Ligand SMILES: Cc1ccc(-c2c(C)noc2C)cc1S(=O)(=O)NC1C=C1
C-alpha cells in the first residue's frame with residue numbers, strides 16, 4: 001500500500017467506476033459475446049477496470065505507475081482495436097480525460 | 113490565456129525533454145504531413161491533429177492554464193496514432209513505448225499546481 005495507490009483507488013477508480021460510460025470497461029472484453037473473433041489476435045494484453053479494481057483491493061500493485069500503465073493499456077487497447085467512428089472510442093476518451101485530470105493531482109512522492 | 117506553474121515546468125523540462133530525445137520520437141516531433149507521407153484520408157479521420165512540437169511551443173508560449181490541459185494534448189497525440197494506423201504498424205509500437213514513458217514520468221510530477 002502506498003499514498004499514490006490509495007489516491008488511484010479512492011479518487012481515480014471511484015470516479016471512473018461509477019461513470020455512465022464505464023459499463024463496457026467494467027469487465028474483460030468477451031470476444032465470443034461481442035462477436036469479435038480477431039480481438040485476441042490484435043490485443044495481446046487485455047485489461048479492464050474490474051481487473052484493476054480487484055488488483056487495487058488485493059494489494060497487487062507495488063507502485064502507482066504499474067496501476068497507471070494498466071489504465072493506459074485498457075484505453076490504448078480500445079483505440080487500437082476499434083474503428084475511429086465507433087462510440088466506444090468516444091466513451092474511452094471521456095473516461096481517459098477524467099483519468100488524466102485526476103492523475104494530475106496525485107501525490108508526487110510514493111511513500112509506502 | 114495561460115500561466116507558468118511548477119507542474120507545467122516539470123512537463124516541459126522533465127517529461128517533454130525525456131520523450132523528445134527518445135529514439136522513437138522522430139515521427140512525433142512535428143505535425144503529421146499527410147501530403148508528404150501520402151495519407152489523403154488522414155485529416156478526414158483525425159480531426160484534432162497534435163504533435164510534441166505543437167505541445168512544446170504551447171509550453172514555451174504559456175498557452176496552458178493547467179498541467180492537465182498539456183497532458184490532454186499528449187493524450188490526443190498518442191490516441192490519434194492508435195486510431196488512424198493499423199494495429200500492426202511500427203508507429204503504433206513506437207507510440208506505446210513513448211506513452212509508457214510519459215505516464216512513468218507524470219507519476220513523479222509535483223502534486224499541487226502552484227503559479
Ligand atoms: C459492449 C462492449 C463492450 C466492450 C467493448 C470494447 C472495449 C471496451 N474495448 O474494445 C471493445 C470492442 C465494446 C462494446 S460495444 O459493443 O462497442 N458497445 C459499447 C459502445 C457501447
Ligand SMILES: Cc1ccc(-c2c(C)noc2C)cc1S(=O)(=O)NC1C=C1
Pocket residue numbers: 139140144149192193196197201202203
Ligand atoms: C514517417 C511517419 C510520420 C508520422 C506518422 C504518424 C504519427 C506520428 N501518427 O500517425 C501517423 C500516421 C507515421 C509515419 S510512418 O510512415 O509510419 N513511419 C514511422 C514508423 C516509423
